[PDB]
Amino acid sequence: YKLSGVEVSGNLAGHSAEIEQLTKIEPGELYNGTKVTKMEDDIKKLLGRYGYAYPRVQSMPEINDADKTVKLRVNVDAGNRFYVRKIRFEGNDTSKDAVLRREMRQMEGAWLGSDLVDQGKERLNRLGFFETVDTDTQRVPGSPDQVDVVYKVKE
Numbered sequence: 001y002k003l004s005g006v007e008v009s010g011n012l013a014g015h016s017a018e019i020e021q022l023t024k025i026e027p028g029e030l031y032n033g034t035k036v037t038k039m040e041d042d043i044k045k046l047l048g049r050y051g052y053a054y055p056r057v058q059s060m061p062e063i064n065d066a067d068k069t070v071k072l073r074v075n076v077d078a079g080n081r082f083y084v085r086k087i088r089f090e091g092n093d094t095s096k097d098a099v100l101r102r103e104m105r106q107m108e109g110a111w112l113g114s115d116l117v118d119q120g121k122e123r124l125n126r127l128g129f130f131e132t133v134d135t136d137t138q139r140v141p142g143s144p145d146q147v148d149v150v151y152k153v154k155e
Contacts (some may be wrong), residue, residue: 001031004069013078019043031070033137048114052078053137053147082112091153095129106149117149130155
């Protein structure tokens, strides 16, 4: 099966132009399910950079029996945009909060940027103080548009 095209629809939160480029297909490209999954993940990652922490993406192939071609229908729902209430470090028993906090690129009170959160993780990992560093972007009970960013570390 060949790909005839990719049609994106839904709530793209103003990022249609970038998303269209992420779903660009080459002339004569064949349908491949794992390429579809990668594309969906690329879209979710992009939306995360802008504070859409829980986007939904669903793809649906439309098969053309006569031409043996597939048209890919991609539905995107960016969902809610979240800002950060607190950045929390859990597991730092020896390393003082201030040492971890100066490595942060995400600001408290600002829109979530999943890339900023990831940069903080990489910076903490680079220090060599921790065996493991994981991040959890958690919803805040009672506050619909807030997340906490929790860095879970093991010393």
